[PDB]
A paper describes a structure:
Each protein member of the αRep library has the same general architecture but is endowed with a unique binding surface made by the juxtaposition of hypervariable residues. In the dimeric structure, the binding concave surfaces made from the variable residues from each monomer face each other and the dimer resembles a closed bivalve shell.
The crystal structures of the two bidomains were determined with a resolution of 1.94 and 2.55 Å for A3_A3 and [name] respectively. Importantly, the crystal symmetry generates a dimer with a neighbor molecule via its A3 subunit. The first one is the dimerization interface established between the two A3 domains within a dimer, and the second involves the A3 domain and the [name] domain of the same molecule. The dimerization interface between two A3 domains (1170 Å2) is higher than the interface (638 Å2) between the A3 and [name] domain of the same molecule. In the interdomain interface, the variable residues of the [name] domain are in contact with a non-variable part of the surface of A3. Thus, the interaction between the [name] and A3 domain observed in the crystal structure may not reflect the interdomain interactions taking place in solution, for [name], but is rather a secondary consequence of crystallization of the dimeric form. The resulting curve shows that [name] is rather compact in solution (Rg = 26.8 Å, Dmax = 90 Å), and could adopt different possible geometries of the closed forms.
Numbering used by the authors: 23 to 205, 222 to 406
Amino acid sequence: EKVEMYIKNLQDDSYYVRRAAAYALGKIGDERAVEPLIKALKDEDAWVRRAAADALGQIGDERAVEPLIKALKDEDGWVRQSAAVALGQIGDERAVEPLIKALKDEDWFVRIAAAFALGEIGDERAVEPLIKALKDEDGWVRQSAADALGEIGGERVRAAMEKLAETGTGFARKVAVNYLETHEKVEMYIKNLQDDSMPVRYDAADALGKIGDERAVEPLIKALKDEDPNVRASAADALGKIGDERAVEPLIKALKDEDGYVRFSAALALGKIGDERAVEPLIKALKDEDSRVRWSAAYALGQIGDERAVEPLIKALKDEDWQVRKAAAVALGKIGGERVRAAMEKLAETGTGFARKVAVNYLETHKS
Ligand code: NA
C-alpha cells in the first residue's frame, strides 16, 4: 500500500515528486511498477529518467528491455549508463548488440557501464568488442573490460587471451598474461539448483530463466517445491520467461503457495505461457488475501485473453486496492470481445464511481 502512491505520483506535474516516486520504487517497487516506470523513462527530468532505469533493472522484468535500449541513446550520459547497468541486471540477450555500441560511447562512465553489462549477460558476441576495449584511452574503461571478459570466461576468451599474451602490448598484454597465470554453463546451474546454500539455488533459478534453455524446465519445476520461498518464486518467474508449457500444471499448484510473492510470480508466469488452463485458477485468484496476487491475476488474465474472465474482471473493477481495479480495466481492454462491449454499456449506465468511469472510457475509445 506504499507502492501505489508512488505509482500515481509518477505522473504528477511536479518534477520533484516524480523523482521521489522513482527513487522509492527503486527500493520498494515490484512487477506492478514497470509499466509506469517504462513511461517514466520518457520523462522531461533526466533525474527521473535515470532513477527509472535504475529501478527497472532492479526489478528485472524483461519488458523493460526494448525501452531501456532506446534509453541507451538518451541525451544525458548518466541516463545512458543507468540503462546500460539495468539491461545488464535483466540479462536479456537483445541488449548485447546495442550495448556493444555503448562500448564506444563518448562518455567514459557509460563505456564502463556498457562493459559491465555485457559481462553480466555473458554473451560471447561481446568478447572481441571487449578485447579491443582493452586499448580504450581511459584506463578505468580498460579495467572494466578486463573484468567483463573474466565474467564471460568461455574458451573464446582463453583463445583471445592466449593470442593477446603472445602478441599484445600494454594493458591488454598485462591482462592476458595474468589470465594465463591464474587459470556447458546451463548444466552447471541446473546442478546448482540442488545446492545446499540458498543463494546458490536462487542464483541458479535467476540464471536459468535469463538463459532460457528448455532443459532447465523440469529442474525448475522441482524448484517450485523449494524450501525457501525466494527460490520458489524465482523458479516460477524463470519458467515464465522460458515459456515451456510443461510448467503449466505445477505453476497452477504454485498459485496455492504459502508465500504471496510465489503466487504473485506464478500468476504472471502463467500469463506469459498463455495456456487457457490457467484461466479458471487465475479467476479464483482474483479473490486473494494479497493485493499483489489479485493484481497479477488480472494482468495474467489480460495476457491470456480468454472471455471467461470478463465478468470476474467486472467484479474486480470494485476491488479495495486501487491498481487491482486499474489492472482489471486493462484486462477487459485486452480481451475486448463483444461480451466486454455489452458488459461495459450496462456498467456505463448502472455503474458507480471508478467502475462507471472506466465503462464510459471503454465505450469512448472503441468508437469510430
Ligand atoms: Na538517479
